[PDB]
Amino acid sequence: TFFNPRTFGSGEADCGLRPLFEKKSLEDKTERELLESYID
Amino acid sequence: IVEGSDAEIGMSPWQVMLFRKSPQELLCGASLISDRWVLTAAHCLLYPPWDKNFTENDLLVRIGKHRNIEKISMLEKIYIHPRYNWRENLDRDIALMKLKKPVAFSDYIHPVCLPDRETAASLLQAGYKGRVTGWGNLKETQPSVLQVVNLPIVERPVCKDSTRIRITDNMFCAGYKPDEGKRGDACEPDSGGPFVMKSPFNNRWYQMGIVSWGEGCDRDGKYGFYTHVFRLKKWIQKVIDQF
Numbered sequence A: 001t002f003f004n005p006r007t008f009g010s011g012e013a014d015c016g017l018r019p020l021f022e023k024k025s026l027e028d029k030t031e032r033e034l035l036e037s038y039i040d
Numbered sequence B: 001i002v003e004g005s006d007a008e009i010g011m012s013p014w015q016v017m018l019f020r021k022s023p024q025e026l027l028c029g030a031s032l033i034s035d036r037w038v039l040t041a042a043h044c045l046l047y048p049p050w051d052k053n054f055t056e057n058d059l060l061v062r063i064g065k066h067r068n069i070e071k072i073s074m075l076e077k078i079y080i081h082p083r084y085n086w087r088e089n090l091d092r093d094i095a096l097m098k099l100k101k102p103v104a105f106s107d108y109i110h111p112v113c114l115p116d117r118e119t120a121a122s123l124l125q126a127g128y129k130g131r132v133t134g135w136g137n138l139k140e141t142q143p144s145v146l147q148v149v150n151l152p153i154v155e156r157p158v159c160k161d162s163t164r165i166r167i168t169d170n171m172f173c174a175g176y177k178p179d180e181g182k183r184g185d186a187c188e189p190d191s192g193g194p195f196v197m198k199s200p201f202n203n204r205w206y207q208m209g210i211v212s213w214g215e216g217c218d219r220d221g222k223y224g225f226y227t228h229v230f231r232l233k234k235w236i237q238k239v240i241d242q243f
């Protein structure tokens, strides 16, 4: 980690994973565009 | 957001809306980075020309789902970058707000990740696309639902050549080139909103930028400018690890 959990609060370990998408293994309607932009 | 699309429910759970308390007025976008810290643009809180010099007690933020389980939180304290240059080019357009009481994460409320060295050097490259979200103008002069648009990061040389405003290493620009076909841009008052990228490695979303400035909205040959979050992560640490 980068932040002390005591000042920062909850979150640096539980961040960027959406309950309704990544956590349910569901892709949102346009994130593939971002993925496509990485691939050359 | 101009030329964007409607956002799906729970698509951007770190989305925060900054409101003027009295009278109630939507002022800017913002992002949730933990259960008690919110990131936004400094000019959303401090820009004297626009008569903006807010005290923590003048604002409220709203998080979560757009009239029942939405979350309204008061602010405990506001932190503006000490070297924020509002008189010139908005250099270091970044601010932190600490919530009065931490919020509970839910299906509709969760923090976005802040990038580390390895992440910002693997994903912060020209050509790669990020995502910007907001409730700002749909056209140069408002949506009923949160708007979204994915935009490619533009090489520095092109960004600098697109404007007479002095660009610093604390900013980056994004948007489609006149002939790339697609369009899209953030627009006032999308400022403070996050420019996020999904890492294909750990499947996590990281906030790489903050809507900062632009000339007009979605105009050909021009691009949106964003505060370079990673370059200012040290200040975020000092403030959070300080207090």
Ligand SMILES: *C[C@@](*)(O)[C@H](CCCNC(N)=[NH2+])NC(=O)[C@@H]1CCCN1C(=O)[C@H](N)Cc1ccccc1
Residues within 6 Å of the ligand: B028, B043, B044, B088, B089, B090, B165, B185, B186, B187, B188, B189, B190, B191, B192, B211, B212, B213, B214, B215, B216, B217, B218, B223, B224, B225
């Ligand atoms: C505060 C935000 O709502 C807004 C975001 C603009 C984003 N625009 C595009 N096309 N992505 N920022 C501003 O309105 C800032 C605040 C100061 C004035 N300003 C501008 O963007 C001016 N139009 C240009 C500018 C003025 C001063 C310094 C730098 C740029």
Ligand SMILES: *[C@@H]1O[C@H](CO)[C@@H](O)[C@H](O)[C@H]1NC(C)=O
Residues within 6 Å of the ligand: B046, B048, B053
């Ligand atoms: C903000 O308002 C406070 C007075 O209440 C003032 O001391 C401070 O100089 C203002 N910040 C400016 C104008 O940059």
Ligand code: NA
Residues within 6 Å of the ligand: B175, B176, B185, B218, B219, B220, B221, B222, B223
């Ligand atoms: Na443009």
Ligand SMILES: [Zn+2]
Residues within 6 Å of the ligand: A014, B105, B110
């Ligand atoms: Zn969680």
Ligand SMILES: [Zn+2]
Residues within 6 Å of the ligand: B006
């Ligand atoms: Zn519609």
Ligand SMILES: [Zn+2]
Residues within 6 Å of the ligand: B048, B049
């Ligand atoms: Zn003045």
